Amino acid sequence: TLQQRLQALIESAGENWTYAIFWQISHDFDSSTGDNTVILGWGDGYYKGETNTAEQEHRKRVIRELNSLISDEEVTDTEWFFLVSMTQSFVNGVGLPGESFLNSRVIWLSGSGALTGSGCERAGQGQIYGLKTMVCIATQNGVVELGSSEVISQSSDLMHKVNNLFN
Amino acid sequence: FQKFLDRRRSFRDIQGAISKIDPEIIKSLLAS
């Protein structure tokens, strides 16, 4: 399923992508505007990879709580950015993922300049937490997002793979 | 302690299961 195809995408990718996220469409009925508003949210994700005391104690606590649920290394900023991304949703058109979907286009921010210089808060935070490259690629039922601590430039070879692995 | 064993409960090793948890739960845990 989705996680499998997310791992597939970056375990064959041309360059070194740190993670991959599928933002998934849904519809909630706002009775005020009468609009069946389209929203992007966490569908699935795959992290591949490569602070201070108050920070690391906070993160380690969260990790063992999830471990308690499912079932002590330090938590890198990229692992942590990946995880906190589960909390985020995007109304159609809004934010890096929502712009990509609404306009059916690829948005490629390459280099730390691009990320902070974009004015997208998600890209900015991404730079803060070690990312150098952020890409959103719209598919049929959502958006595939790739991130990397390295700097990667627009390969059609990537957009090729994504088109294949998703309808 | 030279156990091979090996036991994996690191983030990198449980992310698959983590990704499947309802985002609203992750919100509460992250909110502390």
Curated annotation (Swiss-Prot), chain A:
Induction: Barely up-regulated by jasmonic acid. Transmembrane segments: none annotated. Changing residue 44 to A/Q/S: Exhibits an atr2D-like phenotype; dominant resistance to 5-methyl-tryptophan (5MT), a toxic tryptophan analog. Disruption phenotype: Minor effect on jasmonic acid response and no effect on glucosinolate biosynthesis. Myc2 and myc3 double mutant has an increased insensitivity to jasmonic acid. Myc2, myc3 and myc4 triple mutant has no jasmonate-related defense response, is devoid of glucosinolates and is extremely susceptible to generalist herbivores. It is found in: Nucleus. Residues 32-72 are annotated as: JAZ-interaction domain. Constitutively expressed in roots, stems, leaves, flowers, and seedlings. Homo- and heterodimer. Interacts with MYB28, MYB29, MYB34, MYB51, MYB76, MYB122, MYC2, MYC4, AFPH2/NINJA and the JAZ repressors TIFY10A/JAZ1, TIFY10B/JAZ2, TIFY6B/JAZ3, TIFY11A/JAZ5, TIFY11B/JAZ6, TIFY5B/JAZ7, TIFY5A/JAZ8, TIFY7/JAZ9, TIFY9/JAZ10, TIFY3A/JAZ11 and TIFY3B/JAZ12. The JAZ-interaction domain (JID) (82-141) is sufficient for interaction with MYB proteins and most of the TIFY/JAZ proteins. Transcription factor involved in tryptophan, jasmonic acid (JA) and other stress-responsive gene regulation. With MYC2 and MYC4, controls additively subsets of JA-dependent responses. Can form complexes with all known glucosinolate-related MYBs to regulate glucosinolate biosynthesis. Binds to the G-box (5'-CACGTG-3') of promoters. Activates multiple TIFY/JAZ promoters. This is Transcription factor MYC3. It comes from Arabidopsis thaliana (Mouse-ear cress). The gene is MYC3. The chain holds residues 51 to 236 of 592 of the full protein.
UniProtKB/Swiss-Prot annotation, chain B:
Ubiquitinated. Targeted for degradation by the SCF(COI1) E3 ubiquitin ligase-proteasome pathway during jasmonate signaling. It is found in: Nucleus. It comes from the Eukaryota. Induction: Up-regulated by jasmonate, wounding and herbivory. Belongs to the TIFY/JAZ family. Repressor of jasmonate (JA) responses. Interacts with and suppresses RHD6 and RSL1 transcription factor activities to negatively regulate jasmonate-stimulated root hair development. The tify domain is required for dimerization. The jas domain (168-193) is required for interaction with COI1. Homo- and heterodimer. Interacts with MYC2, MYC3, MYC4, AFPH2/NINJA, TIFY10A/JAZ1, TIFY10B/JAZ2, TIFY6B/JAZ3, TIFY6A/JAZ4, TIFY11B/JAZ6, TIFY5A/JAZ8, TIFY7/JAZ9, TIFY3A/JAZ11 and TIFY3B/JAZ12. Isoform 1 and isoform 2 interact with COI1. Isoform 3 does not interact with COI1. Interacts with RHD6 and RSL1. This is Protein TIFY 9. The chain holds residues 26 to 57 of 197 of the full protein.
